Amino acid sequence: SGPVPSRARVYTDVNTHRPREYWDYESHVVEWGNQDDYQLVRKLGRGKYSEVFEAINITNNEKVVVKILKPVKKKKIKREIKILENLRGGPNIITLADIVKDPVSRTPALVFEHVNNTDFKQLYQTLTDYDIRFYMYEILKALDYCHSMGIMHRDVKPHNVMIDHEHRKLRLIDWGLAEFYHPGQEYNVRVASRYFKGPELLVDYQMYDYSLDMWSLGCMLASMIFRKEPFFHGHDNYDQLVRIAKVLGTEDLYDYIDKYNIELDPRFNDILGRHSRKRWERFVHSENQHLVSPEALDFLDKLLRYDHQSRLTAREAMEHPYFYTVVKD
């Protein structure tokens, strides 16, 4: 009785074979830099967990981004720091340049390399078929890297992908929701952002893995190739699942929860209905058809599975025919 357990089908045991220091972030000792090295220039915004600023590193006169954290648990901050340090230098992973103590907030301030980003809302409207494939491949490099390093991002979305379109450079940012994957571990389902939440989160299945990120990526791909951002545009977390079910169908949703011996919230009884699985072609029209190909639709179909175990891994995704036309570096 109770939920049937689940494991990642790749990188399952990466952390158990790393030194304890690698994943035991609660024991991490932070190496603090010199707070005087960074001059704040302008506020970029304020999120749930921090205030973000453009700044200058006065030791090299280079632009950097500074995130001054709102007060939060030392283990959560240590988790983000340890993950950033573990992944530093990896393909398309944002570089943590420094960590300093902000004397006003009395909290840590994380210092990142700057990316000359184009607002995704504006950028996505301009992406060609080739660009979408190219940047999707770049995101996959970052995801296969972090997964291979025992880490799931858990907040993949356009806002967390910074793109310098001029230099064709991409960085996956905002690792504050990321976690180490340990087989059999139950995780918080209150992660990711609504439109990018995987079915596992929406049905409260806690034993999830790297494959969560692949659902989120599929949501991004659908928004890009169909020019509809976000693709699954739910009004709340319940409606989010209904919107998904209107596309993937309710019978396969029941197959998913039945496999894992999960029950839907009874509040779905009055809102879920009965829906057939749709063919992806229904979302194609004259305004997005130039971004769609049989390869794109098959790739999307293989990312957006209810069953997290059935989704392409990041490495499998990079083997897909969709990327045959992308020039390899």
Ligand SMILES: OC[C@H]1O[C@@H](n2cnc3c(Br)c(Br)c(Br)c(Br)c32)C[C@@H]1O
């Ligand atoms: O949000 C205002 C702009 O500044 C960029 N920006 C926002 N949050 C950012 C964060 Br958080 C990081 Br780390 C980096 Br690097 C950049 Br660049 C960020 C995106 C926008 O182009």
